[PDB]
């Protein structure tokens, strides 16, 4: 079960990198909302950031966590340096996607998909 590490040698070190990334994202949201002239609140921007972290809470592989942080840092670099445009930043919010039905009956009415 011996593998080559990416950065972290265990989950404790991986979690430290996660918290540093979260802090960097949390502090950058107010600037992003201003520079990109977004129509969302800073609270919405930070709520979205927290949502994105939370969905990955179950990972226990430090290598997977390392890659998630690597990708998170690249995403933050694109935002901070304004490589993204307004459309790229707003793609986290799916503003034109009408909500898909979730309960069995609503999905049964509209189509065949599970």
């Amino acid at each position: 079960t011996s593998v080559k590490p990416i950065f972290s040698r265990d989950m404790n070190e991986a979690k430290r990198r996660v918290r540093e990334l979260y802090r960097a994202w949390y502090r950058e949201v107010p600037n992003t909302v201003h520079l990109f002239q977004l129509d969302i609140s800073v609270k919405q921007g930070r709520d979205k950031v927290r949502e994105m972290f939370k969905k990955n809470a179950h990972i226990t592989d430090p290598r997977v966590v390392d890659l998630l942080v690597i990708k998170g840092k690249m995403e933050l670099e694109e935002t901070i340096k304004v490589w993204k445009q307004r459309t790229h930043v707003m793609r986290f919010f799916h503003e034109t996607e009408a909500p898909r039905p979730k309960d069995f009956l609503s999905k049964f009415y509209v189509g065949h998909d599970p």
Partner: protein, 206 residues
Amino acid sequence: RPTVRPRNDVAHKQLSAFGEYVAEILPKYVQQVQVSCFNELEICIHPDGVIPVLTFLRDHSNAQFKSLADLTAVDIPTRQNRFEIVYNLLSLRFNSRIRVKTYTDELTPIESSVPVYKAANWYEREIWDMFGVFFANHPDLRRILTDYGFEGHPFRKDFPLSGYVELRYDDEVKRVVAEPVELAQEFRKFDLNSPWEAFPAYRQPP
């Protein structure tokens, strides 16, 4: 024989001899050496050997492979290490080419070869972007070809041809938006392979 490509035995022997030469000098890393019937020399190495093997081929006086022609990856999902990393090098001094191949999986970094060849910089970014292979100690590893915020690595065999999202302008929000991809005409998959074996010379033992 007008239609058959002629063989070149002189080049086949030279490359075979140099293949043994390389494998004798770097036994720590070389796993396999082979020469194709059209005379291309391939060195297969353990991924730890990337920097030492490339440095030897660039700097050694009987090698002098000063030019990195190309660096790419191939995705083979059936393998435990699905990604094959391919270095194609050119030696102007000896008017010869060589191919170096190693392997990695999704979670195992490969050492960046920018220290050996500055040409490797963008190639490794392209491999990261298209295949998701992470290169360690790269001066600036980030996407290069895909759109900003693009999720996934399109050149993987299990990434769909048309992707997952498509763009359009939306008037209500006055910007370009991304939405799940729907196609007016689905791409029509073709099953073209003949059920009769073509090349007996490559038949795999059963």
